[PDB]
Design a protein around this nucleic acid. Structure first.
Lengths: 130, 144, 178, 60, 258, 134
RNA sequence: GGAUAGUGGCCUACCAUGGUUUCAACGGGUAACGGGGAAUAAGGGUUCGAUUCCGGAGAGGGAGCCUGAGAAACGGCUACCACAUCCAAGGAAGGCAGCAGGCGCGCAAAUUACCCAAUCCUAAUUCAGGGAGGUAGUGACAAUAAAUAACGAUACAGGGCCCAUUCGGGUCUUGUAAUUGGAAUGAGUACAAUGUAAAUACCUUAACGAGGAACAAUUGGAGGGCAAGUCUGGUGCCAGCAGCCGCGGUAAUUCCAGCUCCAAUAGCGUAUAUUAAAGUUGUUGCAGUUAAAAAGCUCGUAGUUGAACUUUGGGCCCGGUUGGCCG
C-alpha cells in the first residue's frame, strides 16, 4: 500500500504488548536533554510471514518481531523503549557511501508530492538514496 | 411620493426592483454567482493543503522596508498557482523545498493585508505540525 | 434515531464587551457574593433579560385579559415563592424593576452568610462545595440553590458532617493516630 | 521590481537576543481566590489615587 | 412506499396516548381492527403505562393468552389490538370492568363500570343499506354489522347491542335536546345538548352544541355521539362530566383541594 | 445496615398474575448501602412470603447516601415465580442457571453454514470423504 | 376502440386547428428533495435547512421481467455499458449511498466490540430472530453544573472615637508579610453495596489520599478604537510587528527577551460563510443640482393610481361589563 510500512525489528528485553505507550528514541536522541523522543503508542503487533498480516497481542523478549504504528516518525533506524534513560545502540556502518549521482527531473506536470513520497518510500525500504 | 410605487396591489411591481437592484450589493453577486466556486483559487473553503515549489521574497510598498519571506504553494485540489506568506518570523529555516504545507486565509476575505502585495493566503500547518508551536519549542518537525 | 434531547444556553455575551465602567460594576457584585467566574453572573443576567422580556408581553394586553391574569398570577407566585419580590408589592411592576441584586441575594451562599455558618463569603463557598451543609434531610453540593424562604428554616449542618458530630474527620484521624 | 530577494537574514533577532530563564514566583491562587485578589487590589487596597485611577503605574 | 407500512416511530405518535419519548424510539403499533390507527389505543400502553399492572412487554404478552382480559365480550389475545371508543374490558378476577371513554381534558379515561353496565354497549351507526338478497344491515363505528334493523333507524343514530348475541336492544333518535358526546377535533371531551344544525349541503355537516354552563361550541357531525336525551343519560358519565371550566379555575380547584 | 426500617409505598394487589408490585424506599444511616438479598429476607416476613418469593430491582443510591429508592415484587409460589419472572433475574440470586450458548457471532456463523448446506448433509459428508481421500 | 383495478391522448383510427405566453410561457444552471425547522436580532427582515419527524427518489448508469395481496425489488433475476475475484484455461461467482472496517479524495469526520437485557417488528407465533435497536470504546462537534483552596494567632500601616495624664494605650478594624498554626473535602486510588445479560460508568462509603520543590491553568495584548508600562536589555527601516491607522533609518510607550498588568477561563485564538451592526438594500425605512445617479424630448401598450354623490339622524323599551351611597 502507500506509506503503511510495518517496521521489522528484534526485541531484546521486555514483553511487547499491542496498545502500549512507547517512547521512540532515534539516533540523535541523548538521555541528557530534549531530542526526537515521542511518546506515541503502538497500534498493534503483526507477525511476519509470506505476505499476510498475523495479529498477535503480546510477544515476549528475545525474539524478532515487526510492529505497526510506526514509519511516520523514524527515518532510517531507531529504538522504541519505555525506560527514562534507555541508551541507543551503536550506529550501523553502511557498506558503501553514495558516490555515483544523477539529476532527476520530470517533464510532466507538478507531480512533486508524488516524486517526494516515492523517494521517501525508497529511503524507508532499504539503505537507499539519501 | 418618494418616487416609489405605493399601490395596494403593487407587490410584484415593488418586487422586481428588489430582485434586480439588490445585485449592486457585494454580498449578493459574490455568493450566488459562484465566484468563490469557479474564480477563487480556494474553492470556497476554510483550509487547504499544498506543495511548495520555490522560495520567493517580496519587498514592501509605501514608506516601509521589509522582505516578508513569502513562499509559493501549489494547492493539491485545483492544481493552480498561489503565492503564500508565512505570518511568522524565522520560520523560513524550518520550511524547505518539497514540503507539504496547509494554508488558509488572512481575515480580509480576499484582498491583500498590508505592505505585502499580492499574497492572500497564510501558512497554517507545515508537514503535519504548526509554526506557532514551532517557535515555542513545544513540538519538533519530523524529518519526513 | 431517538428523540433529540433539548439543550440550550443560559447566558448571552453583550453587544458591548469592553467598557471600563461595566467591568468595575460586575466585579463588585461578583466579589461581594463570592463568584468564581463571570459565567454565573452572565447566566442570571440572561434570566433577568428573559423574565423582563417574558413580563413585557403581558403588559401588551388589556387588564383582566384571561391569558394575562393566569400568566401574571403564576408569574408573581413564582417570584414571591423564591422571594425576589416583596409580599405587598405584587402589582406586576417591580418584576421589571427587579435588579440583579434581588436575584443574587437569594443565592444559597448569601443565606449561609446571613445565618452566619461561614462568617466569610469565601468560607461559604468552601463549606458548600464540600457537602458540609444540607437542607432538611437532603445534602446539597451545588452552591446555587435559590432557597425560597420555605426551606430556609432547614438550612443546618448535615447529620453526616465532620463539624456536626459524626466522624471526627479524615486529616484529623491521621494526626490523632500519629 | 524584484522577486528573488535574499533569504539569509530570517531568524536574526531571535538568534541574537540574550537568553534568560523564567524567574520563579510564588504560586498564584486560581479561581474565586484570584477574583478576590482583584477585589482587594482595586478598591479595598488602592494605593495610587492622585487624580485618576491607574492600573500599572511606572517608576516616576 | 412499496406498499403498506408496518411500524410507528416514537415521534409521529398522536399525543392522546400520552407516551414518553426517551423509553425507546419506537411505538407499539396497533394492528388493524375496529377503530383507526390514529383513533385507537393499544393495549400495551393501556396495561403498562396507563393502569400500571405490568412493567414489561413480555409480561403483557403472557397475560392475554392466559385468558384473563375480555374485550367486547370476546377474550382476544392480540397485543396490538386497537382498543377505541365504547369498548368494554371484562376481567374475571379483580372484579373490575373497564369502559374506555374520552375524559374532560381530551384523552382516554380510566372509568370503572359495573357488570350490569358492562352487559351492553352503545354504538354510532354509520351507514344503513340493503345488502345482497335485500336484507338491510347497519354498521357501527367499530365496523360490527347488525342485520334487519327497524325502519325508523336512519343515519347518525345510536344503537344498543346486546354484546352477547350481537343483537340490538335499544335505539336513540337524533333530534333537538339530545345529550351528545364530541369524539374528535380540538374541542373533544365535552357533553352538551343538540339544539339545531345547518344542513350545509356541500359536505362537512356542522352542529352547534351548548354546554350545561351555557358554553356554546361548534363541531362537525363526524365527531358527535348521542348518549341520551336532555337530563337522562344512557351511560355512566366519567368524573367532571365534561364541563370544561376556564383555565384559571383548575388552579382554583387545585388550590382548594390542597 | 443499622435500623434500616424498610417502608413500603404505593402497594397494590394484582390477582391478574398473583403477585403484588410496589415501590420500596429504605434508609441506611451511617452506612454505604444495603445488599439486595437482605431486603428480600427482610421483606419475606412482612408480606408472609419466603426468601425465594420476592424479586427486587433498581435501588439507585441517592446523592449523599442514607436512603435508597427501588421497586420490588413478591411472588406467591415458587412454581408460579418461575413462569412469570424472566430468566435474567431468576439466575441472579439462586432460582436459575444460564448455560452459555457459546457466543452470539458463533451462532450466526453456524446458522449461515447450515443454510449453505441443503438437507442434513450426512450424504454430503461421506461423498467428500471418498472424493478427497486422495 | 384497446389496456389498467379504475377516469384520462395512456396508446391507436378519423375529424377540427387548436393549447400556453411580458400577470415572465419556453429555455440555462442551481456548491436546489421539499416541508415540519435552525441561526440572528424592537418590529420588519436575511441566510441555511442532506441531517433525529412526515411525505418523495436511488441500491453503479439504463431497459425488461419473475413470484408475490403488496416490487419494475437489485442483501431477486436477464441483455449492454465501466470495473473486478478465482483459477490445475472449460467457466463460475459480483454489486457496502445496510454495520463495522479498507483504499483514493478531501480542511474535514470513530471500534473490523458486546448484548437482544431494554422500545418494538416478523413467523406456524410467549420460547426464535432482527449490526432494527440498546450498551460499551474513540471523541474539546456542539450544550449544563463545577476543581486548582478557605480560616485563626504575631510585625507593620491604618479610621471613625475614649482618655487630653507627655508622639502613650489604643481597646473594633482592612490589607501587606524571605511568620507560624490547626480544621476541610475533592481529583486520583476501590474493601464493599447498588448499576448493568454480564459488565464499564454516577453516587454512597473500610482504608490511602496538600503546608508548596508541591496534587503547579492556559490562550492574546499592553499607541488609538481596544481596560492593560513613557519598566529593563538586545537589533537598528535589516530582522520585523500590524485585521485598519500606523512604529523600526543606534534614546522602539507597537520588533525580540525578563517583571507587572489587563480580558476570558478549561477555555482561548486563527481561517471561511451568514446575521445585527446596515437608515450600506430603505414596504415599514435610502439618495438622485454640486458626494455615484432624472432616460434629450414627446406619444403610447401592459401595469399602477383614480371626482364628489346613494342611511344621515330622532325617539320608545329590554337585558349584559366597570366601579359607586348603603360594608
Amino acid at each position: 500500500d502507500k506509506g503503511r510500512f510495518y517496521a521489522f525489528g528484534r526485541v531484546f528485553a521486555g514483553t511487547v504488548k499491542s496498545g502500549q505507550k512507547v517512547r521512540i528514541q532515534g539516533p540523535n536522541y541523548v538521555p541528557g536533554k530534549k531530542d526526537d523522543l515521542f511518546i506515541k503508542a503502538i497500534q498493534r503487533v503483526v507477525l511476519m510471514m509470506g505476505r499476510f498480516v498475523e495479529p498477535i497481542d503480546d510477544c515476549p523478549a528475545g525474539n524478532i518481531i515487526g510492529l505497526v504504528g510506526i514509519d511516520q516518525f523514524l527515518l532510517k533506524t531507531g529504538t522504541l523503549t519505555t525506560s527514562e534513560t534507555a541508551h541507543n545502540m551503536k550506529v550501523m556502518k553502511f557498506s558503501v557511501s553514495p558516490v555515483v549521482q544523477v539529476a532527476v527531473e520530470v517533464k510532466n506536470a507538478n507531480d512533486l508530492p508524488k516524486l517526494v513520497e516515492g523517494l521517501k518510500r525508497l529511503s524507508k525500504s532499504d539503505p537507499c538514496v539519501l | 411620493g418618494k418616487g416609489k410605487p405605493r399601490g395596494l396591489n403593487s407587490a410584484r411591481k415593488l418586487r422586481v426592483h428588489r430582485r434586480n437592484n439588490r445585485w449592486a450589493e457585494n454580498n449578493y453577486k459574490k455568493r450566488l454567482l459562484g465566484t468563490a466556486f469557479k474564480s477563487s483559487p480556494f474553492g470556497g473553503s476554510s483550509h487547504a493543503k499544498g506543495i511548495v515549489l520555490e522560495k520567493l521574497g517580496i519587498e514592501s510598498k509605501q514608506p516601509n522596508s521589509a522582505i516578508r519571506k513569502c513562499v509559493r504553494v501549489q494547492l493539491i485540489k485545483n492544481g493552480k498557482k498561489v503565492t503564500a506568506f508565512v505570518p511568522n518570523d524565522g520560520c523560513l529555516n524550518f520550511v524547505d523545498e518539497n514540503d507539504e504545507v496547509l494554508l488558509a486565509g488572512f481575515g480580509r476575505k480576499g484582498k491583500a493585508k498590508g505592505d505585502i502585495p499580492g499574497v492572500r493566503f497564510k501558512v497554517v500547518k507545515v508537514s503535519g505540525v504548526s509554526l506557532l508551536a514551532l517557535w515555542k519549542e513545544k513540538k519538533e518537525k519530523p524529518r519526513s | 434515531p431517538r428523540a433529540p434531547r433539548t439543550y440550550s444556553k443560559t447566558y448571552s455575551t453583550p453587544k458591548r464587551p469592553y467598557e471600563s465602567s461595566r467591568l468595575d460594576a460586575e466585579l463588585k457584585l461578583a466579589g461581594e457574593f463570592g463568584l468564581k467566574n463571570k459565567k454565573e453572573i452572565y447566566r442570571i443576567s440572561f434570566q433577568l433579560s428573559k423574565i423582563r422580556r417574558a413580563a413585557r408581553d403581558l403588559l401588551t394586553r388589556d387588564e383582566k385579559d384571561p391569558k394575562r391574569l393566569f400568566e401574571g398570577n403564576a408569574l408573581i407566585r413564582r417570584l414571591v415563592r423564591v422571594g425576589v419580590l416583596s409580599e405587598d408589592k405584587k402589582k406586576l411592576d417591580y418584576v421589571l424593576a427587579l435588579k440583579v441584586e434581588d436575584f443574587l441575594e437569594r443565592r444559597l451562599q448569601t443565606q449561609v452568610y446571613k445565618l452566619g455558618l461561614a462568617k466569610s463569603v469565601h468560607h461559604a463557598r468552601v463549606l458548600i462545595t464540600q457537602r458540609h451543609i444540607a437542607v432538611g434531610k437532603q445534602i446539597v453540593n451545588i452552591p446555587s440553590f435559590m432557597v425560597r424562604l420555605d426551606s430556609e428554616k432547614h438550612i443546618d449542618f448535615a447529620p453526616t458532617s465532620p463539624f456536626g458530630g459524626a466522624r471526627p474527620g479524615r486529616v484529623a484521624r491521621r494526626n490523632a493516630a500519629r | 521590481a524584484k522577486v528573488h530577494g535574499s533569504l539569509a537574514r530570517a531568524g536574526k533577532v531571535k538568534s541574537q537576543t540574550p537568553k534568560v530563564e523564567k524567574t520563579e514566583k510564588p504560586k498564584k491562587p486560581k479561581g474565586r481566590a484570584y477574583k478576590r485578589l482583584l477585589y482587594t487590589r482595586r478598591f479595598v487596597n488602592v494605593t495610587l489615587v492622585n487624580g485618576k485611577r491607574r492600573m500599572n503605574p511606572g517608576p516616576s | 412506499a412499496r406498499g403498506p407500512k408496518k411500524h410507528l416511530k416514537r415521534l409521529a405518535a398522536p399525543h392522546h396516548w400520552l407516551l414518553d419519548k426517551l423509553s425507546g424510539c419506537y411505538a407499539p403499533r396497533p394492528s388493524a381492527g375496529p377503530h383507526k390507527l390514529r383513533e385507537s389505543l393499544p393495549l400495551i400502553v393501556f396495561l403498562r403505562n396507563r393502569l400500571k399492572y405490568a412493567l414489561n412487554g413480555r409480561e403483557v404478552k403472557a397475560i392475554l393468552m392466559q385468558r384473563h382480559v375480555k374485550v367486547d365480550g370476546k377474550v382476544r389475545t392480540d397485543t396490538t389490538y386497537p382498543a377505541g371508543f365504547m369498548d368494554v374490558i371484562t376481567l374475571d378476577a379483580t372484579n373490575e370492568n373497564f369502559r374506555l371513554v374520552y375524559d374532560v381534558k381530551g384523552r382516554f379515561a380510566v372509568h370503572r363500570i359495573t357488570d350490569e353496565e358492562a352487559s351492553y354497549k352503545l354504538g354510532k351507526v354509520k351507514k344503513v343499506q340493503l345488502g345482497k338478497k335485500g336484507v338491510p344491515y347497519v354498521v357501527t363505528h367499530d365496523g360490527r354489522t347488525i342485520r334487519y334493523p327497524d325502519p325508523n333507524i336512519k343515519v347518525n343514530d345510536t344503537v344498543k347491542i346486546d354484546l352477547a348475541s350481537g343483537k340490538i336492544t335499544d335505539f336513540i333518535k337524533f333530534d333537538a335536546g339530545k345529550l351528545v358526546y364530541v369524539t374528535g377535533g380540538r374541542n373533544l371531551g365535552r357533553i352538551g345538548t343538540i339544539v339545531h344544525k345547518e344542513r350545509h349541503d356541500g359536505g362537512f355537516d356542522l352542529v352547534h352544541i351548548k354546554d350545561s354552563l351555557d358554553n356554546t361550541f361548534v363541531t362537525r357531525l363526524n365527531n358527535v355521539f348521542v348518549i341520551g336525551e336532555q337530563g337522562k343519560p344512557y351511560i355512566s358519565l366519567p368524573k367532571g362530566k365534561g364541563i370544561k371550566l376556564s383555565i384559571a379555575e383548575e388552579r382554583d380547584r387545585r388550590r382548594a383541594q390542597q | 445496615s443499622d435500623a434500616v426500617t424498610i417502608r413500603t409505598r404505593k402497594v397494590i394487589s394484582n390477582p391478574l398474575l398473583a403477585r403484588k408490585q410496589f415501590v420500596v424506599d429504605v434508609l441506611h444511616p451511617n452506612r454505604a448501602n444495603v445488599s439486595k438479598d437482605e431486603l428480600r429476607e427482610k421483606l419475606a416476613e412482612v408480606y408472609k412470603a419466603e426468601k425465594d418469593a420476592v424479586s427486587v430491582f433498581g435501588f439507585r443510591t441517592q446523592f449523599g447516601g442514607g436512603k435508597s429508592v427501588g421497586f420490588g415484587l413478591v411472588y406467591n409460589s415458587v412454581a408460579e415465580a418461575k413462569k412469570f419472572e424472566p430468566t435474567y433475574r431468576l439466575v441472579r440470586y439462586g432460582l436459575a442457571e444460564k448455560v452459555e450458548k457459546a457466543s452470539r457471532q458463533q451462532r450466526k456463523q453456524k446458522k449461515n453454514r447450515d443454510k449453505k448446506i441443503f438437507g442434513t448433509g450426512k450424504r454430503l459428508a461421506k461423498k467428500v470423504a471418498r472424493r478427497n481421500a486422495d
